[PDB]
Copies of this chain bind each other. A is one copy, B any other.
Amino acid sequence: GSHMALSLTADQMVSALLDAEPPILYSEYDPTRPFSEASMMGLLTNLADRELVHMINWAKRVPGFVDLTLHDQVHLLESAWLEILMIGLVWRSMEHPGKLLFAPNLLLDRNQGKSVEGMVEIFDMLLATSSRFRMMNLQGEEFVCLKSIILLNSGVYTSLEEKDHIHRVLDKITDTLIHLMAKAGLTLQQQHQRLAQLLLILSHIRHMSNKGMEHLYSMKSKNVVPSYDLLLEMLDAHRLHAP
């Protein structure tokens, strides 16, 4: 059978989201060749490209996403892809104060970011967001809800029925977040305050993603930002993959 996004209970929503989770990838580098030989930007690009393929399959598994037209799915991934990579990074880097866990074989500190121009400012923001989630003791079940909110919210400001559906899907994830906070034993006031602190961090994640896109658009290379066409091609080619 098929569960419609709005029929899901809080526990089914958490389960579906935990199931859809992409795997933690490794940075593609020879551990026998010296670390000086590495490109730094070359490694992050190769990693982001591989992670983006998995993000396609995860998005198609987020409740309410396939209910949207192919056109609208592309718009949401186009606006959200960097924010989704960034939230994943900041979550992985939580237990590593002063370091960013890009991959299990790629844990980079602030000074390493200084190698690439304009990268230091982005690293510092990611580091601050990571420490903030650590202070808040962000839970895995909350992280998946926040990652799903980013996807459905980021490109929502671009038909009243399709617009209401995303709002309703977003209300269902909010209900799931609150449920987790009530089970963790937070009072009603504490529940609202934690929900507000988590959603306020999403504003800073959008900010980092805009600074990230600015950096990408400043690069001399022509195919450094995933275009609408490439994202459409990626979502349509998923139909040809084996389940």
Contacts and interface: CB of A to CB of B under 8 A. Distances in A.
Interface in A113-168: 125, 128-129, 132, 149, 153-154, 156-158, 167
A202 B196 CA distance: 11
Copies of this protein in the assembly total 2
A179 to B, nearest CB: 10
Contacts of A125: 157
Contact of A195 (B156, B192, B205, B210): B192
Contacts of A200: 149, 153, 170, 199, 202
9 contacts: A153-B203, A154-B203, A156-B204, A174-B193, A192-B192, A195-B195, A200-B202, A203-B205, A214-B214
Contact of A175 (B149, B156, B193, B197): B193
Nearest to A174: B196
A52 to B, nearest CB: 21
A189 interface: yes
Interface residues of A, number: 36
Query: Which 8 residue pairs spanning A and B have beta carbons closest together?
Result: A210-B210, A199-B199, A174-B196, A171-B193, A128-B157, A203-B206, A203-B203, A153-B200
Given A157-B204, A189-B175, A196 B170 contact: yes
A102 B204 CA distance: 27
Q: A interface, by DSSP: helix, strand, loop or mixed?
A: helix
A188 interface: yes
A207 interface: yes
A196 B145 CA distance: 13
Contact of A192 (B175, B203, B210): B175
Most buried by B among A171, A196, A203, A210: A203
